[PDB]
Structures are given as C-alpha cells and as structure tokens.
Amino acid sequence: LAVLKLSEQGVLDKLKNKWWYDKGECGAKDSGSKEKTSALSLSNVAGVFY
Amino acid sequence: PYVMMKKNHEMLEGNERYEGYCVDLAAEIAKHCGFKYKLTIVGDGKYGARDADTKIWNGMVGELVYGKADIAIAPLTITLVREEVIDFSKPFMSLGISIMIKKPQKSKPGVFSFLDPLAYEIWMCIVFAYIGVSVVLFLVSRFSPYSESTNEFGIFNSLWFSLGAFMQQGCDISPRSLSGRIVGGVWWFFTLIIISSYTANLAAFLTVERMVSPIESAEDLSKQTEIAYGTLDSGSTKEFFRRSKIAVFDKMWTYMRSAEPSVFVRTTAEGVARVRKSKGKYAYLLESTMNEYIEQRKPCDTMKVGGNLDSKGYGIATPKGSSLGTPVNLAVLKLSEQGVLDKLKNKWWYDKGECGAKDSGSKEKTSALSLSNVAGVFY
Amino acid sequence: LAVLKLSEQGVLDKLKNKWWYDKGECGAKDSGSKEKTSALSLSNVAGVFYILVGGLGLAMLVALIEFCYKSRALFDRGVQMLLTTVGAFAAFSLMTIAVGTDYWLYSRGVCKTKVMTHSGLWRTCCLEGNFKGLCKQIDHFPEDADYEADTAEYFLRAVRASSIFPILSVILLFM
Amino acid sequence: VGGVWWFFTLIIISSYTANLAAFLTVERMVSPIESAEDLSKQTEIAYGTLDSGSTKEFFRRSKIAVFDKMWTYMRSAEPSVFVRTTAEGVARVRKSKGKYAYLLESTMNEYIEQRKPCDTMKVGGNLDSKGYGIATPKGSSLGTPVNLAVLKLSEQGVLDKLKNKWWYDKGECGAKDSGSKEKTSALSLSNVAGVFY
Amino acid sequence: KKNSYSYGWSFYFGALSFIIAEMVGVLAVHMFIDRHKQLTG
Ligand SMILES: NS(=O)(=O)c1cc2c(cc1Cl)N[C@H]([C@H]1C[C@H]3C=C[C@@H]1C3)NS2(=O)=O
Ligand SMILES: NS(=O)(=O)c1cc2c(cc1Cl)N[C@H]([C@H]1C[C@H]3C=C[C@@H]1C3)NS2(=O)=O
Ligand SMILES: NS(=O)(=O)c1cc2c(cc1Cl)N[C@H]([C@H]1C[C@H]3C=C[C@@H]1C3)NS2(=O)=O
C-alpha cells in the first residue's frame, strides 16, 4: 500500500528527478535538432570574412 | 513447358502428340533404361496430395499408389508425405520460391527533359519577367529629354542586356543612371537565385536517380509497403510461410493475413494477370522455374528478381518397391553429368523464349549524362 | 507467477511488438524508407518574383521624381562640415552606448555564479529568473584539460574574452 | 546566334556541375566486370581451374559453345592456369588485381568471401549443378530413416536454418556487413590532375 | 535545439554605428576632394 501511495503523489516522480538530475549537471540533448546545421551558419565561412 | 501438346494434336496419335521438357526427359530415360513409355495425362488433373476427410490420395501420386501409373515424370515436388508412399529418385531440376514483379518500363527521357528541374509555370514566368524588365529598362533610360543621345539603351539593346544578365555571360553595355541600375541590379539578384536553384535541383534529380535501388530480396520486399505481394490461395507456397520459424516470413505471413486488399489469388494465371494490372505495384510469389518461363513469354513485361528464398526440387516418381526405381535412379545421374539436363534446360526455357534478359544491365549506364538527355538543347 | 513467467520468456513483449505492429495497418516505420524526386514549384521561388516586380515599380518611381526635380529646378563645405560633426559624435554615441550595454543578445541562461537571459559584450546578466538584476560575467570557460588539445579557437575565444575589436572600434572613432 | 548559344552553355555547364554532385555523393559500386559469359569473352581476364578435379572434367565434357570456348582458351593459355591446391589458386586471384579469376564450388566461394582478407566476390550463378549427400552403404538398414530425415529438415527449414545461420553469423567479414557506411571524400590532386596537364 | 537566441537593441545600434561611420567616412573623402580643389584650382 505504501508503494502505491508514493507513486500517485508523485513522490517517486520527485525522488527520481532529484537524484538523477541534481547530482547530474551534465548537459542533456545539447545537440537538439539535426537541422541546426541546415542553414550554413557564420562559423562555417567566417574565415573568408577574415 | 513441362508437357504440352501441339496445335495439330488431333492430327497426331499417341506419344507423338505431346511435346515438352518431361516428354524429352521420358525419351532420354528409355534410351538409357530400355522400356516402352506411353504418355498419359492424369484424368483428375491435379498434383498428388492426401486429404484426410476420406484418407484418399488424389492426382498423379494417387495413380502411382493405386496402380494406374508405372512412373510419374512430372513437376512433382519431392516431399515427405509423398516419399513415404511412393519413391523418388534424386531431383532432376532445382528451384525455389521466388518473386515475379512487373519489369520497370524502359527509361525514355523526353527531348525537353532539361527543362524538368523547374516547372512549366516557372519558365513561363521567367520569359514574362524577361519582357517586363526590358521594357521598364527601356522606359527608364529614355524617360527624359534631358541625356537622350547619351544613353545607348534602346528597346533592342534593353532586351539584349536582360538576356546577357539571365544567362550570366554579361553584356558590354551597363546602365549609368541611378534608376537604370535599380532595374539592372534587381534582375541580377533574380538571375542569381533562379540559375542556382536550377543547378541544385538538377543535382537533386541525378542524386536520387543514382540512389533508387531495385527490390532484390524477400526482406527487401518486407521492409517496404509500397509494393504488395500475394501467393496462391491453395499451394505449398502458402504452407511454407506458416511452417517456417523465421520472423521475416512470419511477418510476411501476417501481412498476407491482414492486408485489407486480399493478396491471395485462386490460381497462377490469375496472379499473372494481377501483375499486369497494377503497373509495377504488385509482386508475386511463386516457384522459380515457373517464374523463369513466364518472363520468357510475350508481352515479356515481367522479370525475375532476387534469389530463391527456399529450395525445392522436382523429382521422377515411381511406386513404392517397384523394380523401375533403381535403373531410373541410375538414369537421372547419367543424364546430369553428360549435361543433358543442362541441354534440355537451356533449350526449352530459352528457345521458346526470345524475350530479352538483363537488357538494363549496369545501373551506372546512366552515370554519364548521355546525349539523349540533352538532345533538345541541340535542337 | 504466470505474469512474471511471460515476461522472462518474453511473451508479454512478444504479444505486444507482434500485435501493435503486425496488425498495424499504417505507420511512419512503414512509409519512411521511400524517397522520390520533386520538381520546384512556383511557390518555392515566388518571393524572388515579388522582389523583382517590387524592384521594377521602385525603378520607375525614382525615375519619375528625378525627372520632375530637374524640370522644377547641399553643395557647400560649411554645413557639410557641421553635419559631419553631428554625424561624428552620433557614431561615437551609438557605439559607446552599445559596448557598456548588456543587451547584445536575448537568450536563455543561468546567472547565479554557481529565463529571458540578456547577455552582453563585457557584462552578461539575467532577466526573468528567480530574482532579476544579477550578473554572471564569464570568459575562457573550462574545457578538456584547460582546452590545450586545440590551438585555433582559443585565440578566437580570447578575442571574444579580451574584446579588443569593439574597443578598437571606439578608440579609432575617438582618435 | 549569340542569344541561343548562351542558353546552350547555361544548360550544359549546369548539367556538368550537377552530375559531379551526383557522383561525389552517391558512391555506386564498380559494375561487376564479368558474368558467366563475360569471363569467356574478355580474354585479357584470365581464369583458372583445378588441375585434377570435378571442375576440370566438366569443361572438357561440355557440348555448350560458351564452355567449349572456355576449355579451348585455358588449353592454349599462358601462364599456366592449372593450380595445385585451392589455397594457391585463391592467392593467385588477390595478387593479380582482377586479371585472374578462379572457378570453384559455390560452397567454397561463399566461404572464402566471408573469411579474411575479405577481398573476393561471387559473381554469377552456378554453371553446373551438384549436390552433397548423406551417404549410407549398399544394403543399408538405416538409409530409409536417413532420407526421410533429410526431407524433414528442409520442410521444417533446418537445412536452410543451419546454413544461413552458420555461413553468416560465423562470418567474420562481408560486403553485407560493411556496405551501409558512407562518409565524405575531399578531392585529391589525382582527380583533377589532367586539367593541370 | 530550438535555439531561442535573438539580438537585442544594443547589437543593432552598433550596426547603426557602423553605417553612419561609413557615411561620415565617405563624406570626409568628399571633403578631401574639395580641399584639394581650392588648393589647385
Ligand atoms: N540446370 S538444373 O537446375 O536443371 C539442374 C538441377 C539439378 C542437377 C543438374 C542440373 Cl543441370 N543435378 C543435381 C544433382 C543432385 C543429385 C540429383 C541430381 C544430381 C545428383 N540435382 S538438381 O539440383 O535437381
Ligand atoms: N514493454 S511492454 O509493455 O511490452 C512490458 C511491460 C512490462 C513487462 C513486460 C512487458 Cl513485455 N513486465 C513488467 C513486470 C516484470 C517485473 C517488473 C515489473 C513487472 C514485474 N511489468 S511492465 O513493466 O509493465
Ligand atoms: N539452399 S541450401 O543449400 O540450404 C538447401 C539445399 C537443398 C535442400 C535444402 C536446403 Cl536448406 N534440400 C533439397 C532436398 C529437398 C528435395 C529436393 C531436393 C532434395 C529433396 N536438396 S538441395 O536442393 O540440395
């Protein structure tokens, strides 16, 4: 009864989000979209401006 | 093409009526065994099997078991329930389940296929914008009395400046007024985008045409839901997908179960007609040597792809314990090593063929952008 | 015990990835593999035709007013030198306002020195946080073993860090 | 004349740049340079059989005009294409850079392709047909349980199961294994070296 | 990511600092035209 009580009150949600992430601080999904490099951005051709 | 009859079959009498692959195969055995063979079509007209409703054999094997048949030189696949009741020799011809698909139509580019990376609505709006710029470029440069003789831009020059600007060759005259450089400058940005889009779209056509692959395996048939596939509704091919453990054929089975157009057809020639109707959207699963002969018949628009997903064999059958079984078995091994089974194969499937084989050949035949692609520009 | 038996033998996973998938009539997994060509329609390049006709009407308009101004009818060193001076400190104002300002970039970030983040050239701060108006000024951020595996971008980060180029814009404009 | 010729060179040079962009992107494989018949025509492409074996007896005992050309060509052939062992014959292919081919059983050819140094291909189908078979003596008291068992394994798929497992999963390298990867290539000087010449 | 970086008003005023300094520069050249004209003409 205690396990079913902790899950519906989001305690198992809260204890998950705390221990895996606050003792984390590495970045998550920093790449993101694969089409971020679709537009040929300035860092690709900044040498021509140099 | 195993056993057929000629069109003058009523004119002839007996064994001379019949022609076919098994007919000559019966002829080659009697030369090596020494028996008097009489060809007989089964009166039932079915392959041998057993139905346990009355536990009675039917067809050719039924004539073998009961006593009507002395030998069954036929497309009779060597199985287990047939082997228990009647003898087989070693198989004389090898085959398996393969795929029959409508052959892709012959690639014929139009003479104006170079205009194809842009739409016809675009080339019509380029020529319309060509006229609109050149007239504006004429109206601007000769707008003022104050000068008029200094400007070299008539109409006949202004159509030429917008022509050299679009084909990017550059023209000898250039605008000198402020508003003359506006109409000249914007059209230069227009011809930068359109010509660069035309080239990159043409690179996108030639890349994908170099990437589009045929279907050359049964798993490759399974991974794509564009082309549909069906078997006989009653046959050993249908049994094979059920009795196999492999998950590729099991999902090919459940696909045939649950596809909302039913893929099963009643016989083979109904399945052949379904290949012709769907315009290259329908695949057909059947035996290989049936698949080799059908693509060699007119209208020649089917083809063999891939390979044998299983293996079977056609065998010469004798009744169980009969005396003929061993000298037939020596005759089958004698015909194979002398290349007679090689010769009788190459004759019946190809000389009664004359459809073309591997006419496409290499996929890199269209690598070099040949003259038929851009012959319209020369026109 | 039977439920735990089906999962260890894989049956609950077997009965699921069979049922949802094989009895699934359509899917992105089913249709994703095909790829065919596309000719460019007019709407792909329709804006270039819009700028073109906009460039035509703009050409005819200034051709009209340059004509009328000549028919009806700025050249002196005096007020031109004075307008240059007015343009001089204006460029000196717009750059010197810009450098000290922390509103170069609107972004997302954390400012708590260990969220509508406004970051800047010499001072990067935060806005719409837990509390507004706090600044975390950062340069030469710690990388793999003090970055030393690469040589190129450290000179490019130090030009961002020790930002001489906006300052040398100001100093040449001051001289 | 100047107007239409400009529309000519616009189409051609844009098609030249487009077709390079298709080549350098899509690395379609070399077209497999022979087949069954094409090995007989290209006489600069040598091909060798075993000096005493089943493949040697087949080409002399042939009434087909293609194979009769093949037995004629290897008869008056220099250097000698008859090999002692298969390990010598497989080695003569990899050192001759496609000029020498090898005629062998389909079972060995699929196995050599899966072994290291991985540099072979099986082109074309079988020229003849042969079969390995479980052998019992004359007058066997167990031949009939054997051949029923062989037909049982094929209907249950076991002979096909024991093959496409064994040759493939115990296959260390393969064209099927390595074919999917695709990375970029900068142009070297030898790609455009003729334009400098 | 869906990168939400946008340029604040300080960035564009430096760009407006650029274009005016390009305009003050060419007007300074235009005045350097004229001071040579009184020197020689
Ligand atoms: N060319 S073919 O496919 O008709 C074909 C098919 C076959 C041939 C020979 C030829 Cl040429 N012989 C093989 C061999 C296996 C045993 C039965 C016959 C020989 C010994 N059987 S087969 O697989 O039935
Ligand atoms: N992925 S699924 O829905 O097919 C699925 C989901 C589950 C399965 C098995 C499968 Cl196949 N078993 C687990 C069970 C195994 C042990 C851990 C949780 C229970 C007891 N329950 S679950 O986590 O609800
Ligand atoms: N493709 S294979 O080599 O795995 C393979 C080859 C063969 C198999 C089964 C398999 Cl799995 N069985 C057949 C057998 C079935 C009947 C037809 C020929 C014999 C009797 N022999 S075969 O044609 O030599």
Numbering used by the authors:
A (entry chain C): 748 to 797
B (entry chain A): 404 to 549, 565 to 797
C (entry chain B): 748 to 820, 1002 to 1042, 1056 to 1116
D (entry chain D): 601 to 797
E (entry chain B): 1169 to 1209
Relevant lines from the article:
Ionotropic glutamate receptors (iGluRs) are tetrameric ligand-gated ion channels that open their pores in response to binding of the agonist glutamate. iGluRs are tetrameric ion channels that mediate the majority of excitatory neurotransmission in the central nervous system. iGluRs share a common architecture that consists of the following layers: an upper extracellular layer of amino-terminal domains (ATDs), which are involved in receptor assembly and regulation; a layer of transmembrane domains (TMDs), which form an ion-conducting channel; a layer of LBDs sandwiched between ATD and TMD layers; and a layer of intracellular domains (ICDs), which have not been structurally resolved. Each LBD comprises two polypeptide stretches (S1 and S2) that assemble into a clamshell-like structure with an agonist-binding site between the upper (D1) and lower (D2) lobes of the clamshell. Here we determine structures of a synaptic complex of AMPA-subtype iGluR and the auxiliary subunit γ2 in non-desensitizing conditions with various occupancy of the LBDs by glutamate.
Indeed, seven distinct GluA2–γ2 structures were determined on the basis of different LBD layer conformations. In all these structures, the D1 lobes of the back-to-back LBD dimers were tightly bound to each other, and each D1–D1 interface had two bound CTZ molecules represented by well-resolved densities in the cryo-EM maps. There were two types of individual LBD monomers: Glu-bound (G) and not bound (N). Indeed, Glu-bound LBDs had clamshell closure angle α values larger than 15°, whereas ligand-free clamshells had α values smaller than 7°. At 20 µM Glu, the structural ensemble included only six of the possible tetrameric arrangements—NNNN, GNNN, GNGN, GGNN, GGGN and GGGG—with NGNN, NGGN, NGNG and GGNG tetramers not present. Estimates of the minimal pore radius, Rmin, suggested that the gate region is non-conducting in the NNNN and GNNN structures, whereas it can be permeable to water and ions in the GNGN1, GNGN2, GGNN, GGGN and GGGG structures. In the two non-conducting structures, all four M3 segments were entirely α-helical, with a slightly (one helical turn) unwound M3 in subunit A of the GNNN structure. By contrast, non-continuous integral occupancy of the pore devoid of Na+ ions and water in the gate regions of the NNNN and GNNN structures confirmed that these are non-conducting. Pore hydrophobicity increased when the T617 methyl group pointed towards the pore centre, whereas the pore became larger and more hydrophilic by hiding the methyl group into the channel wall and exposing the T617 hydroxyl group into the pore. In the non-conducting state C, represented by the NNNN and GNNN structures, the M3 segments formed straight α-helices, and the methyl groups of all four T617 pointed towards the pore centre ((i) in Fig. 5a).
